[PDB]
Amino acid sequence: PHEVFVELNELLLDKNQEPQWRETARWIKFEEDVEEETERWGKPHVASLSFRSLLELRRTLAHGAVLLDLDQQTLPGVAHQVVEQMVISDQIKAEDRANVLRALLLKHSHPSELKLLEKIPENAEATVVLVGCVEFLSRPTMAFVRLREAVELDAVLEVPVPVRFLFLLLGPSSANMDYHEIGRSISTLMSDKQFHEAAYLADEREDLLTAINAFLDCSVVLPPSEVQGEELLRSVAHFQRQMLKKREDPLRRTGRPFGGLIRDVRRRYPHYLSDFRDALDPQCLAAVIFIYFAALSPAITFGGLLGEKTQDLIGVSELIMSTALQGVVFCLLGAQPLLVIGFSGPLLVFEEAFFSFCSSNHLEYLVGRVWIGFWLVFLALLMVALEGSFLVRFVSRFTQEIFAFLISLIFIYETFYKLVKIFQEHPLHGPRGQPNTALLSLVLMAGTFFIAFFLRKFKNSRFFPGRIARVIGDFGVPIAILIMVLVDYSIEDTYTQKLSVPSGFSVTAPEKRGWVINPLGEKSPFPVWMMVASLLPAILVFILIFMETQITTLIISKKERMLQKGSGFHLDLLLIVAMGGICALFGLPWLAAATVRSVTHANALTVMSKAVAPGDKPKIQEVKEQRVTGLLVALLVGLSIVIGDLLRQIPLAVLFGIFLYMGVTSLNGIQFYERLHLLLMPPAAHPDVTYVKKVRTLRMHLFTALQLLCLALLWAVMSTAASLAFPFILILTVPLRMVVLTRIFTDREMKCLDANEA
Amino acid sequence: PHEVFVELNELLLDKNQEPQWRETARWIKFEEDVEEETERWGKPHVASLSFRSLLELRRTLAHGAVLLDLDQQTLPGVAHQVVEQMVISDQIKAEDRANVLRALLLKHSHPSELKLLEKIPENAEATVVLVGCVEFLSRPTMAFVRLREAVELDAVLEVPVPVRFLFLLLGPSSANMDYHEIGRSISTLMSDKQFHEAAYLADEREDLLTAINAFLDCSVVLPPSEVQGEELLRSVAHFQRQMLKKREDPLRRTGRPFGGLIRDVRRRYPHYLSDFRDALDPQCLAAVIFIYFAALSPAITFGGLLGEKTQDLIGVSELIMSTALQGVVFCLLGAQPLLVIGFSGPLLVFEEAFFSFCSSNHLEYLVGRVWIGFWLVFLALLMVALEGSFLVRFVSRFTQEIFAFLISLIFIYETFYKLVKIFQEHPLHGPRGQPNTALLSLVLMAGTFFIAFFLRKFKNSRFFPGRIARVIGDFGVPIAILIMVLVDYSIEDTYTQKLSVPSGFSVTAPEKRGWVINPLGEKSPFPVWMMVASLLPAILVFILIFMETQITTLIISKKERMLQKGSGFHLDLLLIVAMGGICALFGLPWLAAATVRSVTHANALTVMSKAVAPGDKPKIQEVKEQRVTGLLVALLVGLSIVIGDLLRQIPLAVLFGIFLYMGVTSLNGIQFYERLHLLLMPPAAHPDVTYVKKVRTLRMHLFTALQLLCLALLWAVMSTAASLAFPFILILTVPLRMVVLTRIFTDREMKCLDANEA
């Protein structure tokens, strides 16, 4: 089976009023049409035919000329043999054979070479369709030629490809046939996957006719009624699938303890040296630059906020080093260095939720986190030993979207509650009570949000090339902070709460904390009941780390990602938590492998294949798969503590704008949020999605109501004094979905509403 | 020719495990398919067929049964006659005739009546397609029945329509034919405009077969290659037009002086009493409510700004009365009461531009406008007398889009220059010098912009029904002002510049001005050279009124608007200017018939026809065409001066936010702005628009550069001391387009780049 690039060049008059063949269309995949007015190739489109043209093609092909395995290699000699064969079958009178021969030898023309060769598959044989209105003849005349050898004909094609099938059609007008449409019909057949397969094996004129019928019976005949909108033709794609259908792992559990750890070590580690060679490509150097701002910006927005929530015990300087200390050690030893380890959003809403519990019960907060670390290590060892990392299968779209919607509700609430706090501390009247502090904070808070919100749309708009914005992922955030910091920097005599960052490798609050947190009680003795009961917070933390890291590994290890090298589930979970349990001893926060950063890292290294035919979705040729982009990003984040002066000038109102921005944008893409929109829209206006078409409106609104009810239970718990339990309530939905929603919704509805990939 | 509603109900098993015909699709126009999973009718779509099904239909129809002019009216009797005719032609054995008869008489079923009757044309005759898999037969069997009389059959259709054509098909499986697809093929043929026309006149089985060929030869045969995106199938609509194509005034000038005035008086005035009767419909009462906020909100945003630009000589109170004084008199006497007369944007940028000239040359500003009024009256009489209102043909998309883009540049600039003025008068430090005044003004200015900007998107989003938002046009502006006024109202001890509106029918600045401006000089004598040279500003004003009113009358008088009553060009131009020349004597501003308000008024009264088949674009059945909605809106605006306390609490920073909002949104829809976007995007990403497809990229960028160069000439003039001349420079583009761009661009390119309607 050979791929075919079929070119239709028609006999037309040039600007010099001379007859010459001009390329009118070409078929690599689908069809591209020359616009005579502008001499520009049109956008690729489905080669729609006219049934009258196909009927005329079938009529002329019967009693037509046939040149099979023509042992000729020169266009003039081939043309002379074609004319002889045509006059054998009485198609052309011997008087006009000279004129037909002269018409065959005319100079071909094209609108304009290396670029187009890339799109066509390398091992392809082109088909030339010579169709034109000839005046000296009185009857239409056709000749299908199959060359014995793939001979690159003499300057006949726009792109030099060995010509295999030569198609000739020369007939006068007034025959009620459009030769331009007959040329498109025969060219479309030759580009068809199965029609040319019958052309290679064709042995008689009847066989080629039978090949047409095998094409028509697989076709779609539209009616002559016109089309008013694109939604009318949306079902044509779905119907065309029905017609053709009628014609036609790391999570595996082994009994060996630490078995998943051993397999993942034996998979990626053999490619350790290869992990450093693949980094020499210049695309990796662009990944370091554009991901460094994707891993540093959330390191200060969460680092700054932890400075307020935890009274500067854990601030930016600790989160900067914790991101760098773990980011380097993970890349040097992890099985998936494409993961960007960082302080996830859900972990932030736990530290704020755990600080209140330690503040209420008169427990040292930092020492209370040391003992969570000692129990995070034990649970991580226990789970990896028993290979219990396959439970991420049960965490499905019902639980993920409830969580990702609850967090985005917290981010929106926490800024607006911070904003209300500012106005109550700095009321509008003619440090506390500072004029212009409340409003400038609102301007900065709403300045970075709308700058970053609109630049995200500009990223996704038609202005930015897809090949570029894939590499540079979410650059609105770094520039929004830079712009509004300078806006606040220019202002003088007005106080805005600045980021609390001390210069040098020092604690954010040196007077209150030391580098090594004493596990036995820093200032006051630590109660012996809490060091044993810290397992309960540790399980709740471990759920937030296990869910965030293992889901992320699932997202980037899919076959669509084209990750050739081994991806490790067990080895990453152990490192992310065993470092998190040891980084807690030094007061540094524990981290998870965030999904948004990791995909931004994975996308930046995806190399889209150049050999894509026009009109086809780009396919990921490969991914760089190196340990250096993750390593350098980790080191550069750690070196951000060198600029402690620049970070100290970032207003805290600027970060809350980004904090609100990340809350709002994370809603996009969540089916829970999308199905909340449908709760307001009328049933007629619901979009044609899988969960909408195959599920009736009433059942869909019941499913969304249950998710919304399961989200109000989480919010009620979070506002009470037992806010630590929201990880446990969250994974009560997994028993709920697998047991309660199983008997309410049929398997058909759950397969549509809870889809692993969609 | 009868419209046909063709229903395909197939023989299928019910939830009771009993055989009964179930409606699977219906064809009023295009096709709607029953989704078996949810029992919901799918969205209308083109009835795409499979060529195998059409071939099987043609095969079975040959040697098939034919019942033409069957003189029967009962479904059991018709079925028995059909069975007799089928067994005559050996299609069904006499042994199985009882089973076929039993299968014909089965109870039909449908998913669910008055609503669907509206969509179908009233005088229509339905076609029933009975297709099902019958097991007791060994061969497929078909019977096409054309009833002699249009008999509403016994509960056979979902919607009771007199059945004319009855189509029967009963055949076993294993015949390599999908009866559901054969049923869709025959149903699609019957719904075709020309196929059933041959069915009514059909006289033999051969004739019906020939009718199929007349259908296929007008069809579009898609290839079996799948479709990846909707842009692939976008060309299918364009190609389908080619296939079918191959098969197939008030501006008039008369020699009589004031001739246009007489015709327009003799056209609309006879319907004067009808203009008041048509207003009793409840839709008119909704127009008054929703347009009152569309005519009042720009009356204060321009009224407030004129308070600053003209030092409160002409403010809100004068613009409110001028809008009401002219709005009432125009509706009582104008030939097109659908016009909403109001202070256009271009007139605002002249009063600001004319005030500077009067301030620089030591001329009384208000007296200087009285003499422009006396010369506006004379020019209006002169133009209407000579019927020179046909010059609006020459003001084309080249001049309109240059103007509408220049103004939107002024609106954006004027707010940002006001905002800079506030900060320099109220600097940020720990009336003048007021703290919190500069930032709160920015918050209010950016508050109303983003509230109104996002609510405009919510208006156009899928959430808001199209039938509603057409009635309620641009309601984001009234609610944005209301929300941010309350936000500023709650604030205390902070000063924001409030609207300057005195309560009662009083001048905005009583100490400086009187109600009647003395034409001979109010305080100081008016120079006798300026009262004669005021013709020069009068011509420049008259261009801004003529261009804005006559273009608006063109926009709403198009045939697509379905304005049955006479629309007047000459009578409106005379009234709008002759009142404007007389309203200037009292210090009130002159007004034009704004396009945006008028279309918002015209749309609110358009009654969309209920008798629209599914999938068709709604057609405007009629427009109310009354003089009362315009009258009541005018009176309600005048009564807004009663609430002088409420208007006095609107901050001037709130209005500048709306002022900026109207500048930004007016850019949308302008091809000049759209072609500026293409100047940045690569040629591959250019949208498939008429001026893009038929004009090469280099020539299009030359045309846009010329427009951008012609916009920089206007801005340079406007920033100089002769800012009054921008009306004259603007209509220098009409000679430029008709003379200079004629020789640069071919008529093919100008027909695409400058399209009157697109």
Author numbering:
A (entry chain B), B (entry chain A): 320 to 431, 503 to 638, 673 to 854, 894 to 1221
Q: Mind quoting what the paper says about this structure?
A:
The widely expressed AE2 participates in a variety of physiological processes, including transepithelial acid-base secretion and osteoclastogenesis. Both the transmembrane domains (TMDs) and the N-terminal cytoplasmic domain (NTD) are involved in regulation of AE2 activity. Here, we report a 3.2 Å cryo-EM structure of the AE2 TMDs in complex with PIP2 and a 3.3 Å full-length mutant AE2 structure in the resting state without PIP2.
To investigate whether PIP2 regulates AE2 substrate exchange activity by allosterically disrupting the interface of the AE2 TMD and NTD, we introduced mutations (i.e., R932A, K1147A, and H1148A) into AE2 and then determined their structures. The mutant AE2 proteins were expressed and purified under the same conditions as wild-type AE2 and a map was reconstructed at an overall resolution of 3.3 Å. Analyses showed a strong density of the AE2 NTD which was not identified in the AE2IF/PIP2 state. The mutant AE2 TMD also adopted an inward-facing conformation with a RMSD of 1.704 Å compared with the TMD of AE2IF/PIP2 state. Aligning the TMD of the AE2IF/REST state with that of the AE2IF/PIP2 state by gate domain showed that inward rotational displacement of the AE2IF/REST core domain is greater (with a RMSD of 2.280 Å) than the displacement of core domain in the AE2IF/PIP2 state. PIP2 densities were absent from the dimer interface of the AE2IF/REST gate domain. Loops and β-sheets between TM10 and TM11 of AE2IF/REST state (missing in the AE2IF/PIP2 state due to their flexibility) stabilized the interface between the NTD and the TMD through several electrostatic interactions (between E508 and K1073, K348, and D1079) and hydrophobic interactions (between I347, F349, P363, L506, I510, P511, A1074, V1075, A1076 and P1077). Electrostatic interactions formed between E356 in the NTD, and K1157 and R1211 on the other protomer further stabilized the interaction between the AE2IF/REST TMD and NTD.
